[PDB]
């Protein structure tokens, strides 16, 4: 089997991407944030504290003939940005782009933090990291991908995120028309539960490539590119007037600037992030200070190849017995 679904930016900055997901019988379609940095499929629901729901579409398990309470199971998750959610668990039928999993754990939120409430466009998350990170207790649950894997034509999924445009998540096949040149594969460590890999270096604009190992994670659920302070300083030094602002929370730059590209290495291959991908617009409405899309990972504890990086590539998440990651230009 295979599946193919379009993923759409939630706003004009590509802050996140939503993908329609069918849950239950008859189908209830919710728009979920596919997150290769976590491993819980959770939804706003009829159980979510009413004051914490503001415009989201909810899953109502009592209206699904295939929903079953997973008795005694609870979940609770905290994300890198400080947001969180928790609740109980149902199993139900879940379909993405025509690919169906029966008995998928659907984590129903009883509580969500303010950042989730305030984002009316995201109805929940669909985790695509390794199932070892799943938070369900006392019986850990499998991700949608892990459940689908055996049935797929090939044990892979691909992320093809758009810049200010829709893109695609495919399951079970590699669309050879969706990228240019060849796909370069690189080793993955699953030790921390992430799609963790080592970039071979970087360049800023038309500058020379610096060969240096940068361990980080491929994370579709993180907006920006978070890299070591040395790398990030080298980038922003090429933008007149750019500075790190403790009050704003990162590097800002004059909105009048033209940003240089940023290149990262994948083995001997190179992925080029155009400068425009690094512009996240005014820090507040009407400001002439703009927020940068490349930020320091110092004090996160991990480097994160988030959407800024991933949307410059066609990315293969190869879930074979020994997982790997592939990157192609597009």
Asked about 35 being catalytic, the answer comes back as yes
Residues 6+ apart with CB under 8 A from 286: none
- The boundaries of every CATH 2.40.70.10 domain in the chain are 5-174, 175-330
Candidate list 35, 40, 119, 160, residue with the active-site label: 35
Q: How many residues does the chain have?
A: 330
Closest C-alpha to 144, from 168, 124, 157, 126: 126
Which pair of structure tokens corresponds to residue 160? 């093809």
Rounded Cα distance between 42 and 123, Å, is: 9
Rounded Cα distance between 317 and 305, Å, is: 14
Closest C-alpha to 79, from 116, 32, 26: 116
What SS3 state is found at 147? helix
What CATH code is assigned to 5-174? Answer: 2.40.70.10
Model resolution, angstroms: 1.1
Helix (H) / strand (E) element for 229: namely helix 229-236
Phi and psi at residue 189, to the nearest 5°: -100, 130
Which segments within 184-255 are labelled E, that is strand?
184-187, 196-204, 210-218, 225-227, 243-245, 250-254
Q: What angle do CA 59, 158, 89 make, to 5 degrees?
A: 25
Candidate list 64, 86, 131, 199, residue with the active-site label: 199
Give the DSSP letter of residue 122: -
Closest C-alpha to 65, from 88, 92, 85: 92
**Are 168 and 4 spatial neighbours (Cβ–Cβ below 8 Å)?**
yes
User: String of b and e for 246-260 (b: at least 16 CB within 10 Å)?
Assistant: eeeebbbbeeebebb
Which pair of structure tokens corresponds to residue 119? 């984002």
Which pair of structure tokens corresponds to residue 110? 């009883």
Rounded Cα distance between 140 and 52, Å, is: 26
Way it was determined: X-ray
Rounded Cα distance between 175 and 245, Å, is: 42
Rounded Cα distance between 15 and 150, Å, is: 33
Rounded Cα distance between 136 and 145, Å, is: 16
What CATH code is assigned to 175-330? Answer: 2.40.70.10
Asked about 160 being catalytic, the answer comes back as no
């Amino acid at each position: 089997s295979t599946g193919s679904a379009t993923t759409t930016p939630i706003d004009s900055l590509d802050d996140a991407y939503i993908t329609p997901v069918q849950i239950g019988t008859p189908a209830q379609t919710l728009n979920l944030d596919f997150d290769t940095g976590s491993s819980d499929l959770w939804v706003f629901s009829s159980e979510t504290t009413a004051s914490e729901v503001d415009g989201q579409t909810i899953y109502t398990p009592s209206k699904s003939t295939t929903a079953k309470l997973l008795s005694g199971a609870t979940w609770s998750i905290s994300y890198g940005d400080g947001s969180s959610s928790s609740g109980d668990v149902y199993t139900d039928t879940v379909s993405v782009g025509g690919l169906t999993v029966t008995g998928q754990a659907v984590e129903s939120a009883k509580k969500v933090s303010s950042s989730f409430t305030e984002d009316s466009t995201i109805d929940g998350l669909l985790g695509l990291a390794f199932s070892t990170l799943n938070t369900v207790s006392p019986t850990q649950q499998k991700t949608f991908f892990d459940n689908a894997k055996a049935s797929l034509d090939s044990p892979v999924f691909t992320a093809d995120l758009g810049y200010h445009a829709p893109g695609t998540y495919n399951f079970g096949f590699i669309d050879t028309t969706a990228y240019t040149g060849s796909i370069t594969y690189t080793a993955v460590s699953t030790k921390q539960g992430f799609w963790e890999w080592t970039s071979t270096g970087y360049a800023v604009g038309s500058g020379t490539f610096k060969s240096t190992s940068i361990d980080g994670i491929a994370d579709t659920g993180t907006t920006l590119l978070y890299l070591p302070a040395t790398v990030v300083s080298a980038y922003w030094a090429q933008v007149s007037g750019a500075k790190s602002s403790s009050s704003v929370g990162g590097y800002v730059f004059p909105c009048s600037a033209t940003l240089p590209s940023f290149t990262f290495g994948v083995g001997s291959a190179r992925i080029v992030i155009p400068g425009d991908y690094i512009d996240f617009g005014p820090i507040s409405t009407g400001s002439s200070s703009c927020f940068g899309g490349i930020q320091s990972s110092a004090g996160i504890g991990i480097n994160i190849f988030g959407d800024v990086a991933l949307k410059a590539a066609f990315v293969v998440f190869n879930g074979a017995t020994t997982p790997t990651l592939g990157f192609a230009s597009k």
